CSV table of C-alpha atoms in Angstrom, one decimal:
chain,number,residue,atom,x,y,z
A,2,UNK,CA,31.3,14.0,13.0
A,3,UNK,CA,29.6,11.0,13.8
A,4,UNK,CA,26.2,9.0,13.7
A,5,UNK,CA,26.5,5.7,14.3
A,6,UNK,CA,25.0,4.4,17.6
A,7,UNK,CA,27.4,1.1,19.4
A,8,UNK,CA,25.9,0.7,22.3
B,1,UNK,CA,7.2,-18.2,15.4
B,2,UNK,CA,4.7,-16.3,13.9
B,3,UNK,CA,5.0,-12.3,14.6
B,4,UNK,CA,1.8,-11.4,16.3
B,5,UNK,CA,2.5,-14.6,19.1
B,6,UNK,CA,6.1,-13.5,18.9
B,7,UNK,CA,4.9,-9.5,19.5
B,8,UNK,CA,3.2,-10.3,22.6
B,9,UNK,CA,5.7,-11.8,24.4
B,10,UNK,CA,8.4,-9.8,23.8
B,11,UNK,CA,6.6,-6.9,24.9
B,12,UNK,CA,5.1,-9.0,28.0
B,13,UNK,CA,9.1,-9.9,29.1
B,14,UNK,CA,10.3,-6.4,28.2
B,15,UNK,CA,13.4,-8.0,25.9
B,16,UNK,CA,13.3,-5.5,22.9
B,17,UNK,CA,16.6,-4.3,23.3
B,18,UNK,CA,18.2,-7.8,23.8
B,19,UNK,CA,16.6,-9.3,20.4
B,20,UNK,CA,17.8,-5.8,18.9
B,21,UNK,CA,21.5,-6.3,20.0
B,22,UNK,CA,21.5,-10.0,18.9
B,23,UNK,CA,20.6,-9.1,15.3
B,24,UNK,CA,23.9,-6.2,15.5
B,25,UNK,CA,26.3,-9.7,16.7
B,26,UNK,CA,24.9,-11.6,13.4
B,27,UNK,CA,24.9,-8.7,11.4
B,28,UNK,CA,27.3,-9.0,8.0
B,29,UNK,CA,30.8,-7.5,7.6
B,30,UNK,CA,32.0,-6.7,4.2
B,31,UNK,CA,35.1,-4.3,2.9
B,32,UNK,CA,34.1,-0.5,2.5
B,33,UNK,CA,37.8,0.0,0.3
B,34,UNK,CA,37.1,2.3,-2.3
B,35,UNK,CA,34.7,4.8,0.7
B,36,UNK,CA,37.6,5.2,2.9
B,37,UNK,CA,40.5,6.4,0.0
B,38,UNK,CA,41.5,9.8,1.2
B,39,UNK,CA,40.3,11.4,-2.2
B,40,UNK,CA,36.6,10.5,-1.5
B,41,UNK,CA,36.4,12.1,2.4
B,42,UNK,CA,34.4,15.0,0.8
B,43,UNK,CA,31.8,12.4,-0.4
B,44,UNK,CA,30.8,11.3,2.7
B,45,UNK,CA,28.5,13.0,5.2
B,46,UNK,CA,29.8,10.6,8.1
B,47,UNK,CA,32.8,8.7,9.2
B,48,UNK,CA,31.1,5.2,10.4
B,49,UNK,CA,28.1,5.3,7.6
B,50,UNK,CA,30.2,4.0,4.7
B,51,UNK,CA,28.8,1.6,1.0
B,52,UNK,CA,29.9,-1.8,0.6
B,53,UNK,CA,32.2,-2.2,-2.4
B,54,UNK,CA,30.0,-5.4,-3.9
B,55,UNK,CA,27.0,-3.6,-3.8
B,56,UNK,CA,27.7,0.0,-4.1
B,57,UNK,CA,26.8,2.8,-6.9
B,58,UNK,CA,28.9,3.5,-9.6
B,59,UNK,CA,28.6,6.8,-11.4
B,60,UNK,CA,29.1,6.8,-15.4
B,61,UNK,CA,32.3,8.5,-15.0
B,62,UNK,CA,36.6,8.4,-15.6
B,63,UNK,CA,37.2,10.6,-13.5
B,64,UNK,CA,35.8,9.5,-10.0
B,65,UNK,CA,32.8,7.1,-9.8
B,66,UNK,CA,32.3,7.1,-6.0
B,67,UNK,CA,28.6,8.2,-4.3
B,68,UNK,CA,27.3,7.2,-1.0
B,69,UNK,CA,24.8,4.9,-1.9
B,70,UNK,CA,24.0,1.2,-2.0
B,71,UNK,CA,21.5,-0.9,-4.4
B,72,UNK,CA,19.6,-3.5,-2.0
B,73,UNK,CA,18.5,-6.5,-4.0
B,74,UNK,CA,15.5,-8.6,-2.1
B,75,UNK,CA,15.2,-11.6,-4.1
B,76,UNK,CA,12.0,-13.6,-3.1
B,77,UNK,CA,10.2,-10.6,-3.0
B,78,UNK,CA,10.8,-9.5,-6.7
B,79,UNK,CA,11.9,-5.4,-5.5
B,80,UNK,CA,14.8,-3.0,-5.3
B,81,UNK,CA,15.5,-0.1,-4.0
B,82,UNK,CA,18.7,2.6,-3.4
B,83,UNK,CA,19.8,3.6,0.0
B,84,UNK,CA,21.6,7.1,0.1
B,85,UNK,CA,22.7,9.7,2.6
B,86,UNK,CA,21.2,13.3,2.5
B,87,UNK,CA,23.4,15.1,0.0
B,88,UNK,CA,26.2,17.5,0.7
B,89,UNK,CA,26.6,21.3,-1.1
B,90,UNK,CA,29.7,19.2,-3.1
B,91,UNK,CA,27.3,15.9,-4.0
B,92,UNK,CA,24.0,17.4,-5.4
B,93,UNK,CA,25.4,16.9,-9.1
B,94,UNK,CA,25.9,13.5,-8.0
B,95,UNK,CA,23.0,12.7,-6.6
B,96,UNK,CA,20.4,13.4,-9.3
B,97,UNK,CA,23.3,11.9,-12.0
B,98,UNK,CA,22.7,8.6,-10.2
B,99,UNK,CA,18.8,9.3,-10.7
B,100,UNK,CA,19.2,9.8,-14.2
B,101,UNK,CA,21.5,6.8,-14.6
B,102,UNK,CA,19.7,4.2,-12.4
B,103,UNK,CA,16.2,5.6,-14.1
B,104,UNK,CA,14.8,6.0,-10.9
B,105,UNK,CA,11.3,8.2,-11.0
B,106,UNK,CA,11.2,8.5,-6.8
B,107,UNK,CA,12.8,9.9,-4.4
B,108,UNK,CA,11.5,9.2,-0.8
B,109,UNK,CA,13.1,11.7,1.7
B,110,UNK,CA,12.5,10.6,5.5
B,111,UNK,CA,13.9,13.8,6.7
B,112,UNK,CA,14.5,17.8,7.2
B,113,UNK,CA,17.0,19.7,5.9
B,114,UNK,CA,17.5,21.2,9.7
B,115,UNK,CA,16.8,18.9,12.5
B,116,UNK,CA,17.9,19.7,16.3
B,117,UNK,CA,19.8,23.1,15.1
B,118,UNK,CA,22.1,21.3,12.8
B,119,UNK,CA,22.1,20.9,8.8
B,120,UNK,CA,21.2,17.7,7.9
B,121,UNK,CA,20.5,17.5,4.4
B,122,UNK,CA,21.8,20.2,1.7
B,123,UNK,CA,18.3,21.8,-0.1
B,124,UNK,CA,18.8,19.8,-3.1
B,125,UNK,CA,15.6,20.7,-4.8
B,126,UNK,CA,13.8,24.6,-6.0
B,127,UNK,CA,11.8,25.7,-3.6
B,128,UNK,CA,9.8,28.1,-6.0
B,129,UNK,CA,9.0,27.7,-9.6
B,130,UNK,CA,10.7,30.7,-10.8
B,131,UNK,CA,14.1,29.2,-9.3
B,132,UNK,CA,15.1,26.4,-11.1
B,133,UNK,CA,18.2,25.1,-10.3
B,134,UNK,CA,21.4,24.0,-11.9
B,135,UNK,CA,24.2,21.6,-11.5
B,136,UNK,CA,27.0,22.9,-14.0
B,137,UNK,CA,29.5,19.8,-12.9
B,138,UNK,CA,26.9,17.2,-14.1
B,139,UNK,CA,25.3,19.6,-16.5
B,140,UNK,CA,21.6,18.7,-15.4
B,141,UNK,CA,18.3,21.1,-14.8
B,142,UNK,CA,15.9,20.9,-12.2
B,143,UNK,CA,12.1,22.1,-12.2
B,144,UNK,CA,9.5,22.5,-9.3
B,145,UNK,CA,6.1,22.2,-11.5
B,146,UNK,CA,3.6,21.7,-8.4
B,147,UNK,CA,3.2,20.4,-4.7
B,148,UNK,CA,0.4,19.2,-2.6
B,149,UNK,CA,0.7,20.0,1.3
B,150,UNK,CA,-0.6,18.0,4.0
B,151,UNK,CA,-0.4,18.2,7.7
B,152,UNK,CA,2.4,15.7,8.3
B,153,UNK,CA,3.7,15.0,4.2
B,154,UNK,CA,4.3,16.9,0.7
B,155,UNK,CA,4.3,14.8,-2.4
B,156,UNK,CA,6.2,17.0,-5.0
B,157,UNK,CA,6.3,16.7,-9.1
B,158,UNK,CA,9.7,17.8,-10.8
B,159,UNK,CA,11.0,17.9,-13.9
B,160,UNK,CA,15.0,16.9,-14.4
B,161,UNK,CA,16.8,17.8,-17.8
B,162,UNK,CA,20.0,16.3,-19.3
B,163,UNK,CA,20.8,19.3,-21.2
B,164,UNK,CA,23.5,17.1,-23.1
B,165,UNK,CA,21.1,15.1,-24.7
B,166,UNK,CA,17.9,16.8,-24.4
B,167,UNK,CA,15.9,14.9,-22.9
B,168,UNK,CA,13.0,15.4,-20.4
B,169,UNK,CA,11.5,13.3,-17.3
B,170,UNK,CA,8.9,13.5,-14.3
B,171,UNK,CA,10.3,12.8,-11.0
B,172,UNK,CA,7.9,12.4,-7.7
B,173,UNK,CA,9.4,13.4,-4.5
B,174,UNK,CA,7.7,12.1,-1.4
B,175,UNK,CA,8.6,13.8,1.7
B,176,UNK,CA,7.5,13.1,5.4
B,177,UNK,CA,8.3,15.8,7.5
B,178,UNK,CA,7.5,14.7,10.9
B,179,UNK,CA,9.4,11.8,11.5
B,180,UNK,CA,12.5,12.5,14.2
B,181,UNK,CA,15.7,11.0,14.3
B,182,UNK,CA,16.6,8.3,16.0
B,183,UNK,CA,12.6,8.1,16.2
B,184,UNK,CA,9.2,6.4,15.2
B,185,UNK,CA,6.6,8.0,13.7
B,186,UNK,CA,3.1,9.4,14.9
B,187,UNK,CA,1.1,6.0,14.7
B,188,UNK,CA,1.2,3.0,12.3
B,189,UNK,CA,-2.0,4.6,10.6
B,190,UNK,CA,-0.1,8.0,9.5
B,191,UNK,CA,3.4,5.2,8.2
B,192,UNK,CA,1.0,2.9,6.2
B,193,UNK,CA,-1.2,5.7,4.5
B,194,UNK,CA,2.4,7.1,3.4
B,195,UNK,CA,3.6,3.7,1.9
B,196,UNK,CA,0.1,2.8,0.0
B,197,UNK,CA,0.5,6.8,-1.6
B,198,UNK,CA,4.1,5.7,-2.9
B,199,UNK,CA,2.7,2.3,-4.0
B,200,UNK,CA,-0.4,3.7,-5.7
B,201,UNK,CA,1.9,6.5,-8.2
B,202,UNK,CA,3.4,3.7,-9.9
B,203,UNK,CA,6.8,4.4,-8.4
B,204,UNK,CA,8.0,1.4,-7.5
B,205,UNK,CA,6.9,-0.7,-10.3
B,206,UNK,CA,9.5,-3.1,-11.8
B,207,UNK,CA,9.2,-0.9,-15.6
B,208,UNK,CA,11.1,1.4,-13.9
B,209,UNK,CA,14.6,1.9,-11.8
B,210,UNK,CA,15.1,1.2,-8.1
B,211,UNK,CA,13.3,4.2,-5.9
B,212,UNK,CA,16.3,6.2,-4.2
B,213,UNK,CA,15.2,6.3,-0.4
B,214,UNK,CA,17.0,8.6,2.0
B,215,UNK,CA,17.2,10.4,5.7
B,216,UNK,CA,20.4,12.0,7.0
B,217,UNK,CA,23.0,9.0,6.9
B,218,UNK,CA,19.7,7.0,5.0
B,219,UNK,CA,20.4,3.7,7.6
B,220,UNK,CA,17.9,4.4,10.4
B,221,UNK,CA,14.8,5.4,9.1
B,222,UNK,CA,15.4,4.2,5.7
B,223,UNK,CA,15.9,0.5,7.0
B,224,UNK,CA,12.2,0.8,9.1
B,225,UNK,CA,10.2,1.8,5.3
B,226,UNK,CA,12.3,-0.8,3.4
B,227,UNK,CA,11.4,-3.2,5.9
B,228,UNK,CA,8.1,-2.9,6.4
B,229,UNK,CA,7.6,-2.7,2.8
B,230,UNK,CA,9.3,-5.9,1.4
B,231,UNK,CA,7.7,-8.3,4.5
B,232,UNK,CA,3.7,-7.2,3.3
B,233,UNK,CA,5.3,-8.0,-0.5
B,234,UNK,CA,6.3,-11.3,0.8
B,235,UNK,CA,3.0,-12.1,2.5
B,236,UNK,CA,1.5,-11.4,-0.8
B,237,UNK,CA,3.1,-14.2,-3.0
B,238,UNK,CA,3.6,-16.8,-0.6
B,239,UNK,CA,0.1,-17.9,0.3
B,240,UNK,CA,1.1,-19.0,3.7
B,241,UNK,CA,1.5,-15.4,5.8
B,242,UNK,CA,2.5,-16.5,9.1
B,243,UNK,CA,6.0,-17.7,7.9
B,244,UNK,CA,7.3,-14.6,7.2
B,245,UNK,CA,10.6,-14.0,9.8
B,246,UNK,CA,10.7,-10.2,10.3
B,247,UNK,CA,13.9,-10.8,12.0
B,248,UNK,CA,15.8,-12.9,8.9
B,249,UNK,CA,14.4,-10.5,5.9
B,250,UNK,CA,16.4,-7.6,8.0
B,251,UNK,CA,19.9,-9.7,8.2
B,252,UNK,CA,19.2,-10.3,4.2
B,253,UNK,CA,18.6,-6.6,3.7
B,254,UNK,CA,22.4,-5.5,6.1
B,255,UNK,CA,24.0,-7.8,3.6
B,256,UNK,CA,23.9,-4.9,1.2
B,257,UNK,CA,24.1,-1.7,3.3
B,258,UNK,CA,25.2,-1.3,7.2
B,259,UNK,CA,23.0,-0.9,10.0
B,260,UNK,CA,19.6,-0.6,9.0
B,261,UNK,CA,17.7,0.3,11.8
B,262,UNK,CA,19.1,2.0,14.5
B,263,UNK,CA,17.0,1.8,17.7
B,264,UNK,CA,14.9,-1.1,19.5
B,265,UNK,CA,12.0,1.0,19.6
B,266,UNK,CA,12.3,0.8,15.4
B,267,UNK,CA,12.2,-2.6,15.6
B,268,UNK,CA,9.2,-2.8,17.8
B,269,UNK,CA,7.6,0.3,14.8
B,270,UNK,CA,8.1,-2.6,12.0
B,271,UNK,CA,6.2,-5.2,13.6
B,272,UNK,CA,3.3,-3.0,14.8
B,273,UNK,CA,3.6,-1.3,10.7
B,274,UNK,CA,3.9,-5.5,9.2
B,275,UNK,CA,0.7,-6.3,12.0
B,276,UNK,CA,-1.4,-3.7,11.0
B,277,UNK,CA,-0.9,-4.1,6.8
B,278,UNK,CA,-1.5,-7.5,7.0
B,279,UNK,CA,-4.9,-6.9,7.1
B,280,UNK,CA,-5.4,-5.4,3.6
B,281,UNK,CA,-3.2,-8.3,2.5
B,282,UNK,CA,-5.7,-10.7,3.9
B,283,UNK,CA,-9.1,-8.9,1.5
B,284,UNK,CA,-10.2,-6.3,3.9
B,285,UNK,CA,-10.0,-3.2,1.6
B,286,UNK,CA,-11.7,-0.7,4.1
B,287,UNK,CA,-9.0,-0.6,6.4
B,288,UNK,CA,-7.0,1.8,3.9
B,289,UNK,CA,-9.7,4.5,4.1
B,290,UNK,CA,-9.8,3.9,8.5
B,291,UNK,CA,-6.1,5.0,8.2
B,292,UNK,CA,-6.7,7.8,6.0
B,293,UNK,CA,-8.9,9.2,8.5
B,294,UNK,CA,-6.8,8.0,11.5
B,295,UNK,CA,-3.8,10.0,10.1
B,296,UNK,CA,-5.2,12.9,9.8
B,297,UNK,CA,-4.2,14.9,6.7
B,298,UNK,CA,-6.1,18.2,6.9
């Protein structure tokens, strides 16, 4: 699972 | 540039999210070695939210001293503070060891325990008096003595235990309950009357530890209170306001813990939350009982 937002 | 000229026209060219995604390109890279070894993958709550290893947490411990947290260190402005994730059912021994350890005495929780039909955050604390709870690995007890509801926050008192040693201490837990993720909260009246109630219970003064702040991954919302905080600080003891760089104090503050902030529209938050306090800072003490009212806490 993930959070990270790399827009 | 001065932030109030630099506000407007920012918001009059509509270039939030390019000033946002210039601040990620200058942003600091540093080794996360011991938070990837495959013995610590239960100790962390997400993949790509991971400690640096020169300013992470140690536990005093032989056997494993990792924890998901990082100590931020802000210089100039004379005040620290701890950046964790919200425990997991595994790390809840941990977490109030490193509160015992670092002689923290609060805990500021930015989040739920359930948010958008997923667990967030592992119900660390007794709900009910009668339930205390405790953590056999660490071999600490935990106490709910009282809490004081509002419409938007609960500021909790609890008592933590070594039973090793004997020893007793009063821990304030400050949680705001309606701020979403990946969001901004109500208005910069409800943020500010928060922060002045965690600055007025003695908290986060220097004869204590560092104040363990937190959300889900404790990066997003953490980074907007931290922020906020540290440039009305600076403000303070410089005697020349207008050359604080909201901008710079964030790039000091990812040089001990990754991505703080998450979303443009945090960004824009800190500088209407920075805007707003500096009028306190400048000798207008009436303005903290017009956001009392403004927020709304009945």
């Amino acid at each position: 699972t993930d959070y990270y937002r790399k827009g | 540039m001065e932030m109030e000229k630099e506000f407007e026209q920012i918001d009059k060219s509509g270039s939030w999210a390019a000033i946002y995604q210039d601040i990620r390109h200058e942003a600091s890279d540093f080794p996360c070695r011991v938070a990837k070894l495959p013995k610590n993958k239960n100790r962390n709550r997400y993949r790509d939210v991971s400690p640096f290893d020169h300013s992470r947490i140690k536990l005093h411990q032989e056997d494993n001293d990792y924890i998901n947290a990082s100590l931020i260190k802000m210089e100039e402005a004379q005040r620290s503070y701890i950046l964790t994730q919200g425990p997991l059912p595994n790390t809840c021994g941990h977490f109030w060891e490193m509160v015992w350890e670092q002689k923290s005495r609060g805990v500021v929780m930015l989040n739920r325990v359930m948010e958008k039909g997923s667990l967030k955050c592992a119900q660390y604390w007794p709900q009910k008096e009668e339930k205390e709870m405790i953590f056999e690995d660490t071999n600490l007890k935990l106490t709910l003595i009282s809490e004081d509801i509002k419409s938007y926050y609960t500021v909790r008192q609890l008592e933590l235990e070594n039973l090793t040693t004997q020893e007793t201490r009063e821990i304030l837990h400050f949680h705001y309950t309606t701020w979403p993720d990946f969001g901004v909260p109500e208005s910069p009246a409800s943020f500010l009357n928060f922060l002045f109630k965690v600055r007025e219970s003695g908290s986060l003064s220097p004869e204590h530890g560092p104040v363990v702040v937190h959300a889900s991954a404790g990066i997003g919302r953490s980074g907007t209170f931290c922020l906020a905080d540290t440039c009305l600080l600076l403000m303070d003891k410089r005697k020349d306001p207008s050359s604080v760089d909201i901008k710079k104090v964030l790039l000091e503050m990812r040089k001990f813990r990754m991505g703080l902030i998450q979303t443009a529209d945090q960004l824009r938050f800190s500088y209407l939350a920075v805007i707003e306090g500096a009028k306190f800072i400048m000798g207008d003490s009436s303005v903290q009982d017009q956001w009392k009212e403004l927020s709304h806490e009945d």
